[PDB]
CSV table of N, CA and C and ligand atoms in Angstrom, one decimal:
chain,number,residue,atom,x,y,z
A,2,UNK,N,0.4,78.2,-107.6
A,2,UNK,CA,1.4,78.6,-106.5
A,2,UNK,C,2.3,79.7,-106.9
A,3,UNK,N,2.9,80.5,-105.8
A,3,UNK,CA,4.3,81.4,-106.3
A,3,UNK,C,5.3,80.6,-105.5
A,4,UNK,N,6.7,80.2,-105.8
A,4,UNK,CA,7.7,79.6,-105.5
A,4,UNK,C,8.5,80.7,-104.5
A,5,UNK,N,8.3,82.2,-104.7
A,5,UNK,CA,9.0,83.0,-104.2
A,5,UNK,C,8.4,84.1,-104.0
A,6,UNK,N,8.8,85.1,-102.7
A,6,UNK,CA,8.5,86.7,-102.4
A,6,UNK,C,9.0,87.2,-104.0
A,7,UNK,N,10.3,87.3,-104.5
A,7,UNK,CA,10.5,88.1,-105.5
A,7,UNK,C,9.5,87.6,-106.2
A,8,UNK,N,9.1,86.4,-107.1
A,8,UNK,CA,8.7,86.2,-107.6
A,8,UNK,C,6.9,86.7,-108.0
A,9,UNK,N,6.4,86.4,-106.6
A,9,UNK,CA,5.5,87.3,-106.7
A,9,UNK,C,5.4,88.7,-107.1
A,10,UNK,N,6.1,89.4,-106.4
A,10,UNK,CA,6.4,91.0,-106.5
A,10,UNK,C,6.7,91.4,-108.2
A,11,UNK,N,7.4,90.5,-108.9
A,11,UNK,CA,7.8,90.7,-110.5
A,11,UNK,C,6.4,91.2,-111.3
A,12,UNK,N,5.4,89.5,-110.7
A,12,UNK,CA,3.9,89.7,-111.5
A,12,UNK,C,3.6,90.7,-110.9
A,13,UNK,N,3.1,91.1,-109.7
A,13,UNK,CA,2.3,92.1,-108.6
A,13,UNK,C,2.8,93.7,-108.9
A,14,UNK,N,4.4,94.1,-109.4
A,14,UNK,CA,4.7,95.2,-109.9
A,14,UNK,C,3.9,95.4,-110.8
A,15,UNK,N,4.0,94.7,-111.9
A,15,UNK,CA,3.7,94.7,-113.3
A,15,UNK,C,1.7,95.2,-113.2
A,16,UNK,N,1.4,94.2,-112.3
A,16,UNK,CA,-0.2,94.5,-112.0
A,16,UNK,C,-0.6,95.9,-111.8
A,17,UNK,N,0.4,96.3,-110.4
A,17,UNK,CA,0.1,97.4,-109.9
A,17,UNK,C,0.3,98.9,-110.6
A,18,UNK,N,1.5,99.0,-111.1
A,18,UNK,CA,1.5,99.8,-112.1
A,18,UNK,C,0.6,100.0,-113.2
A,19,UNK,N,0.4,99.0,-114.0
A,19,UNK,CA,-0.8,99.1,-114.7
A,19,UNK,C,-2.4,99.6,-114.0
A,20,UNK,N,-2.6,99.4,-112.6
A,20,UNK,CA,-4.0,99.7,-112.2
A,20,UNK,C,-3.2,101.2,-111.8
A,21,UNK,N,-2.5,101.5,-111.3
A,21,UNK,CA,-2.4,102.8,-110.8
A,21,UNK,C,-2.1,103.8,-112.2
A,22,UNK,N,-1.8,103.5,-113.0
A,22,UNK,CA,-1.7,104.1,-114.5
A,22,UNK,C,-3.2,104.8,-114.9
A,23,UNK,N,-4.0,103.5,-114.5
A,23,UNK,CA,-5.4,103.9,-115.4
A,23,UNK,C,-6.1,104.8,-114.2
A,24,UNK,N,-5.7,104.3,-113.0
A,24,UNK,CA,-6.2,105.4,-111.6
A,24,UNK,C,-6.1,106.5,-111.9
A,25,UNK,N,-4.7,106.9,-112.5
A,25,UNK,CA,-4.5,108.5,-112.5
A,25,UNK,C,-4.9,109.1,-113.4
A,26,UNK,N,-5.6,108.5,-114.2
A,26,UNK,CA,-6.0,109.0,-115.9
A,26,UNK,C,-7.6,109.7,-115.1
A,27,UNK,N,-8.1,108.8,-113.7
A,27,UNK,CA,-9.8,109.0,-113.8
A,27,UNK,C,-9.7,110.4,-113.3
A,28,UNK,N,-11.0,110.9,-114.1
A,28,UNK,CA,-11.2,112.6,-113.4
A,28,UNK,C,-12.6,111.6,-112.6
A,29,UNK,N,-13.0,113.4,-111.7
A,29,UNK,CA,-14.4,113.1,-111.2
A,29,UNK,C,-15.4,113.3,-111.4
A,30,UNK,N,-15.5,113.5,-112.7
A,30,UNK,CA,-16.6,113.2,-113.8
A,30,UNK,C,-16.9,112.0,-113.5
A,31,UNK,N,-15.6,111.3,-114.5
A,31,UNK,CA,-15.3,109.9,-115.1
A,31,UNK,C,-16.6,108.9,-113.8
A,32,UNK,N,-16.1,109.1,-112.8
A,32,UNK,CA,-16.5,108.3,-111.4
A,32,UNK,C,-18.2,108.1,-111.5
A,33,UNK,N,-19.0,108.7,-112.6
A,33,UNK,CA,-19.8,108.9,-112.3
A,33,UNK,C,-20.7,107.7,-113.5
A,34,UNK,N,-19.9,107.4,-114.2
A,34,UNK,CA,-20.3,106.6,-115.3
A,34,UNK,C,-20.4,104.9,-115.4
A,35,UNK,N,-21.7,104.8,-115.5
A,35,UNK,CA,-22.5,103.7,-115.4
A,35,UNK,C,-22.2,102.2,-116.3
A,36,UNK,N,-22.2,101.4,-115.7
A,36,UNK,CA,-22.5,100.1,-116.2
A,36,UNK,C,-23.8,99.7,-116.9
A,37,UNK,N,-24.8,100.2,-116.3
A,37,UNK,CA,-26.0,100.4,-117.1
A,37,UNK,C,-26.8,100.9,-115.6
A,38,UNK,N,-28.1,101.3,-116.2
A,38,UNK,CA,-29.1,101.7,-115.3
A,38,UNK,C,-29.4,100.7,-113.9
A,39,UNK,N,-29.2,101.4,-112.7
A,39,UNK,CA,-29.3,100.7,-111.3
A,39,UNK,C,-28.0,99.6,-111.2
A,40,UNK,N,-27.0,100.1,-111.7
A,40,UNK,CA,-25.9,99.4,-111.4
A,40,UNK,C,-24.4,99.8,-111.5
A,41,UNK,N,-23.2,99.5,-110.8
A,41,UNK,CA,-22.2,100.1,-110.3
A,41,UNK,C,-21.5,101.2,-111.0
A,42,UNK,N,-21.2,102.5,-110.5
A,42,UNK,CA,-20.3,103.4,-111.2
A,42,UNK,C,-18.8,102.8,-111.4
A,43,UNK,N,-18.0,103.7,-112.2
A,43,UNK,CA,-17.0,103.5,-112.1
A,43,UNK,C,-15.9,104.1,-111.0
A,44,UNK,N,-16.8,105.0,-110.5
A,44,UNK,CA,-16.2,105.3,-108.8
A,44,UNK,C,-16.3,104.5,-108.1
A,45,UNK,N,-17.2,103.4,-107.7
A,45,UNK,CA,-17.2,102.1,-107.4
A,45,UNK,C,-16.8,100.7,-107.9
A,46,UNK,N,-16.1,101.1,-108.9
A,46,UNK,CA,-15.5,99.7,-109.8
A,46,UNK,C,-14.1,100.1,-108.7
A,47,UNK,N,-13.6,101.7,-109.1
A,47,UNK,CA,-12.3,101.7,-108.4
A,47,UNK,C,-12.1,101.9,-107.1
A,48,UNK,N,-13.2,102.5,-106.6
A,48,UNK,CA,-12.8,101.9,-104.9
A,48,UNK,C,-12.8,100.3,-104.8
A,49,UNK,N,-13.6,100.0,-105.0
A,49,UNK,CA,-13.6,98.1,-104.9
A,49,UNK,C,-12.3,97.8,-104.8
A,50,UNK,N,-11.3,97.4,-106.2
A,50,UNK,CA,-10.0,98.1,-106.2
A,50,UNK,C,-9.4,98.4,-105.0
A,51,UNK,N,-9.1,99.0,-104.6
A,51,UNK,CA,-9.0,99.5,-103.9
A,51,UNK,C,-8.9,99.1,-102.1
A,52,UNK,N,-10.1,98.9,-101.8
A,52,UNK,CA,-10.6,97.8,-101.0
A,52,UNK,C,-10.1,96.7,-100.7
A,53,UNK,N,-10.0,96.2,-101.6
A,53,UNK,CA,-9.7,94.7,-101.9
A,53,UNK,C,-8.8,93.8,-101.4
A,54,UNK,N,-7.3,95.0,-101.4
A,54,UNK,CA,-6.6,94.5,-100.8
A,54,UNK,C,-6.1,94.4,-99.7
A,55,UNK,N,-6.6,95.4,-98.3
A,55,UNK,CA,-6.9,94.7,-97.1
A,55,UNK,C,-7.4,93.4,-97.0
A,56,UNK,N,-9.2,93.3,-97.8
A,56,UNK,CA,-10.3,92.1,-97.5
A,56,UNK,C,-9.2,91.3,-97.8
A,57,UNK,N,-8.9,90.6,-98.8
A,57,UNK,CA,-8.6,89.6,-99.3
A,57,UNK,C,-7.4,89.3,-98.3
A,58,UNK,N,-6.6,90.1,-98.2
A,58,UNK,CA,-5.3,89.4,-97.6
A,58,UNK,C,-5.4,89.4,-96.0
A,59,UNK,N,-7.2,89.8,-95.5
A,59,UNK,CA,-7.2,90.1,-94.2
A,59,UNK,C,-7.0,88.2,-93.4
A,60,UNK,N,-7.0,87.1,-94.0
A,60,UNK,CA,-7.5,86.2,-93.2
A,60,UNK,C,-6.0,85.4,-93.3
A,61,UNK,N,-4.9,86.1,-93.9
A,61,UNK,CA,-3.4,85.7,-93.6
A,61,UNK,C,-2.7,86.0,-92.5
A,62,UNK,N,-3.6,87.2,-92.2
A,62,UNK,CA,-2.9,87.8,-90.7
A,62,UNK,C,-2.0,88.9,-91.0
A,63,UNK,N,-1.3,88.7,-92.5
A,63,UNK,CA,-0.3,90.0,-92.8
A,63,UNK,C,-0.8,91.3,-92.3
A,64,UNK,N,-0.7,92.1,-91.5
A,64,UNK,CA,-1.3,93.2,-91.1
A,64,UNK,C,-1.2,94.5,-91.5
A,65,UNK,N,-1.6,95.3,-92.2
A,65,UNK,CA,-1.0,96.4,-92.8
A,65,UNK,C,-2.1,97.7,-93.0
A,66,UNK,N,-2.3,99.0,-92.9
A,66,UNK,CA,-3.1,99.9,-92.9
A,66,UNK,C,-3.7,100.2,-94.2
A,67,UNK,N,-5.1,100.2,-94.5
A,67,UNK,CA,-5.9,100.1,-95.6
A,67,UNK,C,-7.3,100.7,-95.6
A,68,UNK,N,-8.4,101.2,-95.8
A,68,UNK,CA,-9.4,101.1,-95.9
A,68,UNK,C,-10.6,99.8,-96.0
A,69,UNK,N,-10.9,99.2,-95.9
A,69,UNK,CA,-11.7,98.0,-95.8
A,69,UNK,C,-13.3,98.0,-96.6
A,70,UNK,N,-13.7,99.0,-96.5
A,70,UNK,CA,-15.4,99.2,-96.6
A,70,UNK,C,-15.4,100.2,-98.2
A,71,UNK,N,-16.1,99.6,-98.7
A,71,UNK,CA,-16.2,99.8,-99.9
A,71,UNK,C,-17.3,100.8,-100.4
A,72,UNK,N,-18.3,101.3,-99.1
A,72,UNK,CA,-19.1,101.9,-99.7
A,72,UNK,C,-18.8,102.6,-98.0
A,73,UNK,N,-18.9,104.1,-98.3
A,73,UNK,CA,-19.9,105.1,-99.7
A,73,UNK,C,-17.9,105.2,-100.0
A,74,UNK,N,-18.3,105.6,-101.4
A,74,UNK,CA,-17.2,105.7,-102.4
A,74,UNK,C,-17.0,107.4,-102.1
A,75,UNK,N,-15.6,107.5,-102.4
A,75,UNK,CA,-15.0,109.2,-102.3
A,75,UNK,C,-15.3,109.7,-103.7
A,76,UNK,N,-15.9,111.1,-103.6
A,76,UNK,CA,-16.0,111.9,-104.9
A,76,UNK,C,-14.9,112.1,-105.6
A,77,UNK,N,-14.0,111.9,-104.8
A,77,UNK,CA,-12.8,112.7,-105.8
A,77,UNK,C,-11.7,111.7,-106.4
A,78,UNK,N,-11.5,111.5,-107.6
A,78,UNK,CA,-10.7,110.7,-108.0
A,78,UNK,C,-9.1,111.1,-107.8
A,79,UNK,N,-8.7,111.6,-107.0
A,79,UNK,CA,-7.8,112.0,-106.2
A,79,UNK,C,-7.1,111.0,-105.2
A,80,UNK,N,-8.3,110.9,-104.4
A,80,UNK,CA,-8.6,110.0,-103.0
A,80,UNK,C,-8.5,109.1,-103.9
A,81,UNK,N,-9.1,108.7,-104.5
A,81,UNK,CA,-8.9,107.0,-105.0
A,81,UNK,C,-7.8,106.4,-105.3
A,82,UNK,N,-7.3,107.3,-106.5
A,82,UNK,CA,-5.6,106.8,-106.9
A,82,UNK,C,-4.7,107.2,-106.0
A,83,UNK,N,-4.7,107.8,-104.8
A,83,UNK,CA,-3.7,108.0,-103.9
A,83,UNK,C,-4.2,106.8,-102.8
A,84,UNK,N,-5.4,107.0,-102.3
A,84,UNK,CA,-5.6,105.8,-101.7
A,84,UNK,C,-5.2,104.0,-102.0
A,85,UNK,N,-5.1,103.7,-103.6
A,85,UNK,CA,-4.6,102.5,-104.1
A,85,UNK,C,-2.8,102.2,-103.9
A,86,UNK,N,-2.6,103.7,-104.0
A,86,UNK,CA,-0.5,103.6,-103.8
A,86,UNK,C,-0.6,103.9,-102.9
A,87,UNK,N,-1.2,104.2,-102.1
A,87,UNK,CA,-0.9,104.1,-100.2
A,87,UNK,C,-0.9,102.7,-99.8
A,88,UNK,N,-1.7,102.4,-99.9
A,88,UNK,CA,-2.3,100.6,-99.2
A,88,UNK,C,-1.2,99.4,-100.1
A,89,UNK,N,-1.1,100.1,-101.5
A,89,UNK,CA,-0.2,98.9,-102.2
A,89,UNK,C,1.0,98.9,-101.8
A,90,UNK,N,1.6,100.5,-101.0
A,90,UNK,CA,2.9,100.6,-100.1
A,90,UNK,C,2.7,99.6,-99.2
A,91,UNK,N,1.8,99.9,-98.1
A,91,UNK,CA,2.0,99.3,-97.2
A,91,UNK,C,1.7,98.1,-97.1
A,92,UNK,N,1.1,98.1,-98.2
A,92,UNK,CA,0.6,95.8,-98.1
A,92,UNK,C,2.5,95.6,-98.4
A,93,UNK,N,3.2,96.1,-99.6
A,93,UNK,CA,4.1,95.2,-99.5
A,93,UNK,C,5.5,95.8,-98.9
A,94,UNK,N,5.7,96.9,-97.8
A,94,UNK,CA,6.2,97.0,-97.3
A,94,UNK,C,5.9,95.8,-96.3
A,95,UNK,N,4.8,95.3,-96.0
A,95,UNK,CA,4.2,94.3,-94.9
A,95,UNK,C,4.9,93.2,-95.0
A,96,UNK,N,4.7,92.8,-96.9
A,96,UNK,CA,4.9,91.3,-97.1
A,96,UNK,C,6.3,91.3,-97.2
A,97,UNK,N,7.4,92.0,-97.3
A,97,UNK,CA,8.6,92.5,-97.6
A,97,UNK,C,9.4,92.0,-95.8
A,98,UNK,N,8.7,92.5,-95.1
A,98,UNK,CA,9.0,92.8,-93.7
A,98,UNK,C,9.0,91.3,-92.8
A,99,UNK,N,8.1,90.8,-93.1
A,99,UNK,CA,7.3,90.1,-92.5
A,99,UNK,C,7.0,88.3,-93.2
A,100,UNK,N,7.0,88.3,-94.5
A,100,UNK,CA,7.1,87.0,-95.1
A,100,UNK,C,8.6,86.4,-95.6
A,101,UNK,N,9.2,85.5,-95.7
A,101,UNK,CA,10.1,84.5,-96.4
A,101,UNK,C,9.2,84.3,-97.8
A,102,UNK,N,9.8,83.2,-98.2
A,102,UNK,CA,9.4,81.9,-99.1
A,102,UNK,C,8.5,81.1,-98.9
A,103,UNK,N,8.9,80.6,-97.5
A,103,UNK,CA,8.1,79.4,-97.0
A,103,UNK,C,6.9,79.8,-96.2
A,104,UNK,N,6.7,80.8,-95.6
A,104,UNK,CA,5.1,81.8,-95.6
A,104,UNK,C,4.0,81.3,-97.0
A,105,UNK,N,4.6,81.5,-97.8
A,105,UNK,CA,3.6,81.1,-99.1
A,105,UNK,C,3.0,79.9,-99.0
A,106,UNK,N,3.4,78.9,-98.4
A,106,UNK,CA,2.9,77.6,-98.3
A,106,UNK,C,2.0,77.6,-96.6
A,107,UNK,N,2.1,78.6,-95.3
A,107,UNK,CA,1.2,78.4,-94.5
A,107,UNK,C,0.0,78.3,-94.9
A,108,UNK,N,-0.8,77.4,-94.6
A,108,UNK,CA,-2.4,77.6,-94.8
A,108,UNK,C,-3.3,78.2,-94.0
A,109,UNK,N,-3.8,79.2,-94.3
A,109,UNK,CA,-4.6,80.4,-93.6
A,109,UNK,C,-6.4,79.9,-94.2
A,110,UNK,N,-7.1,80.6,-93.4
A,110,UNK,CA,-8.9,80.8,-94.2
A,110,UNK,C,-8.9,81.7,-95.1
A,111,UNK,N,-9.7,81.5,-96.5
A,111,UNK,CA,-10.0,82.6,-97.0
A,111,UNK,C,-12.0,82.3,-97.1
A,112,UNK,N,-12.1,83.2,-96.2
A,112,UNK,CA,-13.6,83.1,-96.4
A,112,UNK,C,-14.4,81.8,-96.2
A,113,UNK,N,-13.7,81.2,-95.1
A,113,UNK,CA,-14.2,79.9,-94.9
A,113,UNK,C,-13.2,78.4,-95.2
A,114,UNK,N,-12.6,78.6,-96.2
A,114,UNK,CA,-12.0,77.6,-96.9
A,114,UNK,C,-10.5,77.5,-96.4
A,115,UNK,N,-9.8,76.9,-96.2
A,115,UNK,CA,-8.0,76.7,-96.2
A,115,UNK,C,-7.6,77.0,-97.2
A,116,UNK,N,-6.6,77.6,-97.5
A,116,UNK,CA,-5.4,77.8,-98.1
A,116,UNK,C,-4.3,78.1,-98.2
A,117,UNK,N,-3.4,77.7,-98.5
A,117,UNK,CA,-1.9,78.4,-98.7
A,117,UNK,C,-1.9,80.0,-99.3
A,118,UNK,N,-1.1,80.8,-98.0
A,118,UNK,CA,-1.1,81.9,-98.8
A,118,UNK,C,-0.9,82.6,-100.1
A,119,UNK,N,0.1,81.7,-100.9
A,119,UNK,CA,0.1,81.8,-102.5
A,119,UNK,C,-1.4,81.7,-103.2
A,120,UNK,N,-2.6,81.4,-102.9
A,120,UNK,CA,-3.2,81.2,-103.5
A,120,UNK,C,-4.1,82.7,-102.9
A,121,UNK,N,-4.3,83.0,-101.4
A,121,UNK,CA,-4.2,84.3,-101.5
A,121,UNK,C,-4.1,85.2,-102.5
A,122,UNK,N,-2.8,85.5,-102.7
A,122,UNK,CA,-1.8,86.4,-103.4
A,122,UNK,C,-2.4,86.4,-104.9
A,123,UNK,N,-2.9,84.9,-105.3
A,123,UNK,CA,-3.1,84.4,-106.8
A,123,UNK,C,-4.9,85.3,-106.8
A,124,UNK,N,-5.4,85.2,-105.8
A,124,UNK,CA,-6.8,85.5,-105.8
A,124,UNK,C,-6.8,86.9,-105.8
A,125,UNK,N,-5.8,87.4,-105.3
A,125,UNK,CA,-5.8,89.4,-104.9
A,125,UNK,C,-5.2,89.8,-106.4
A,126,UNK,N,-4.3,89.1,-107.3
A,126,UNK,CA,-4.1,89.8,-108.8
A,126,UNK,C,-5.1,88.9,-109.4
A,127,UNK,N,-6.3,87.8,-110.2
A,127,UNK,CA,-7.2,88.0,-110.5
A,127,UNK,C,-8.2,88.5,-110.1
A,128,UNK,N,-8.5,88.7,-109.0
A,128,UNK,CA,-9.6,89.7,-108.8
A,128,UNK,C,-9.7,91.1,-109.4
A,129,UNK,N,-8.5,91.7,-108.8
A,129,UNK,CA,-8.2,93.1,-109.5
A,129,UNK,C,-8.1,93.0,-111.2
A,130,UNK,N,-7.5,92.2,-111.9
A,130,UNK,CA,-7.7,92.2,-113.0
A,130,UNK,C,-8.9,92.1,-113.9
A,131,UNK,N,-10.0,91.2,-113.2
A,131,UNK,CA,-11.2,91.2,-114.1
A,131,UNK,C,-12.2,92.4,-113.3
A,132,UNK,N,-12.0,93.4,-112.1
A,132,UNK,CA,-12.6,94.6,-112.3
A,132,UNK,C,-11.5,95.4,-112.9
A,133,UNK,N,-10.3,96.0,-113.3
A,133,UNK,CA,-9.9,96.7,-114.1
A,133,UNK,C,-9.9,96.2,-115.6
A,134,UNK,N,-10.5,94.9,-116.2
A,134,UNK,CA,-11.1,94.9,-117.1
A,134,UNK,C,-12.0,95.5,-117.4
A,135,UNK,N,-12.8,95.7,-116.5
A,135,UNK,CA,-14.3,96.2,-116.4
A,135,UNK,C,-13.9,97.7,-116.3
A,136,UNK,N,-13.3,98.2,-115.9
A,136,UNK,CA,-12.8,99.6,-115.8
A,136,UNK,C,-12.5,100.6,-117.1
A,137,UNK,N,-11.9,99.6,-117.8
A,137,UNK,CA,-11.4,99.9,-119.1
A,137,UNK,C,-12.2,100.1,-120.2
A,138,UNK,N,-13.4,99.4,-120.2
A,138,UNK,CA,-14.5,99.7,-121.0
A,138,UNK,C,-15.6,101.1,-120.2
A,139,UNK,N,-16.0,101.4,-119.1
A,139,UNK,CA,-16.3,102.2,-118.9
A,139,UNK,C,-15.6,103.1,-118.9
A,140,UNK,N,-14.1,103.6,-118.5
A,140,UNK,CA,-13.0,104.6,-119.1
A,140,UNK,C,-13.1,105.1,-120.3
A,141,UNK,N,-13.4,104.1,-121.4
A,141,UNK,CA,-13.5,104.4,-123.0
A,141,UNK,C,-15.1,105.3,-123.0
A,142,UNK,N,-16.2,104.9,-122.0
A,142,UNK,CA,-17.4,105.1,-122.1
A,142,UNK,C,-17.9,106.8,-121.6
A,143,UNK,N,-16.5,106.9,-120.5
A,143,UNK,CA,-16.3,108.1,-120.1
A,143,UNK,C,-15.5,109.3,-120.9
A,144,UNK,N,-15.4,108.4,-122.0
A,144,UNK,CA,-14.4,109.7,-123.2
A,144,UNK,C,-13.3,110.0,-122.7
A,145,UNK,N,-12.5,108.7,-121.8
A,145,UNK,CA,-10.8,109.1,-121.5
A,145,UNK,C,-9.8,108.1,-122.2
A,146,UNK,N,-8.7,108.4,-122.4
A,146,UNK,CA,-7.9,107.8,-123.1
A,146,UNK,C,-7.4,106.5,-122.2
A,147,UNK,N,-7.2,105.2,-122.4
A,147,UNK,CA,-7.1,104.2,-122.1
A,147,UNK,C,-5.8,103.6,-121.4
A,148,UNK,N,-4.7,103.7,-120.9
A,148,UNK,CA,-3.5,103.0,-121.2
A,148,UNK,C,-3.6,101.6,-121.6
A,149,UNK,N,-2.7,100.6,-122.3
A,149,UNK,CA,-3.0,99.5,-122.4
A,149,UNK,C,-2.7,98.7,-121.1
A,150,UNK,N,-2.8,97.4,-121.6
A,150,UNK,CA,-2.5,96.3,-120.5
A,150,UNK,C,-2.3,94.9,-121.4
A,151,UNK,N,-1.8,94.1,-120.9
A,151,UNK,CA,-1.1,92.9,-121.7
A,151,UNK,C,-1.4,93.0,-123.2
B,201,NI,NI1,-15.2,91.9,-106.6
């Protein structure tokens, strides 16, 4: 659970900065480098990214302007890292506007299932984390310098 709006926002800074750090590092080379043969670029690790946070927060009702569709992916690694601090504005100018405290405990669908929107919230920074895990190894694979993370 999160007990609180700031509270969340403390972890969710700390996330977002870190993903938009390594966003601005990608050139449009970078985008083009492989997980292995017949399988996802890293212009598609970071639109996913990207993406994500419409889908995921779509079944709370928070309503806020985002991209949704994850393919076809933009060439330009421009679009992408501007596209991630656009949406991450407006998701939490949304949640800022629009939620209390006690919002975290309504139970909304995610994908079929109930839940309290804290767990939401909990599902939108793991997800992002284990593809910008994944990110990080193909970054090194693309011959760019890394920033850290925890
Ligand atoms: Ni995913």
């Amino acid at each position: 659970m999160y007990q609180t709006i700031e509270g969340f926002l403390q972890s969710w800074t700390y996330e977002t900065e870190s993903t938009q750090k390594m966003l601005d590092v990608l050139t449009d080379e970078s985008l083009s480098q492989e997980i292995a043969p017949g399988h996802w670029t890293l212009g598609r690790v970071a639109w996913h990214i990207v993406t994500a946070i419409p889908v995921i927060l779509s079944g709370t009702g928070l309503k806020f302007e985002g991209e949704t569709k994850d393919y076809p992916v933009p060439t330009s690694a421009k679009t992408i890292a501007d596209g991630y601090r656009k949406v991450n504005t407006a998701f939490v100018e949304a949640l800022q506007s629009e939620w209390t405290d006690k919002d975290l405990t309504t139970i909304n669908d995610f994908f079929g299932r109930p839940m309290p929107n804290s767990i939401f919230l909990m599902t939108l920074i793991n997800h992002q984390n284990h593809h910008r895990g994944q990110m990080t190894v193909l970054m090194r694979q693309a011959g760019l310098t890394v920033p850290g993370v925890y």
